[PDB]
Structure 1
């Protein structure tokens, strides 16, 4: 039962999420139109490839954590 979609500008960057090398991936996140690998843990928390050891409660929180991590840097597409 996937989280809702989202779309916002966070710290100057566009982050989007939607229900849909890696895994299944029943949800997709993008930072400025580049797909960000994210994963759901059994307890419902989320992580992304740029914050993989630090569970956050939602995919929007994972997107925001990625923007925080990137410090303005473009994301490269995953595998």
Structure 2
């Protein structure tokens, strides 16, 4: 069963998640309406293409880590 959807403003940016050249993912995350590629590992942890090597427990945590990494920068589509 996929994680729940979410929607919040984090550090001034809108992050959203929802169940659904890259993999076929069961879950989508967006930062200011631009899709953030994210991936689930076997142990249930999550990563994203802006923080691929540092697993975090949830897709919201991956979206927040991405906002932290981006330092205000617009995300580009994958």
* TM-score, length-scaled by structure 1: 0.98
Runs of 4+ in structure 1 off by over 3 angstroms are: none
**Cα shift readout 1:24-56 (whole Å, capped 9, x = no counterpart):** 100000000000000000000000000000000
Distance 1:57 1:21 in 2: 25
Structure 1 gaps, min length 5: none
Distance 1:5 1:61 in 2: 13
Structure 2 gaps, min length 5: none
RMSD, aligned α-carbons: 0.3
Count of paired positions:
78
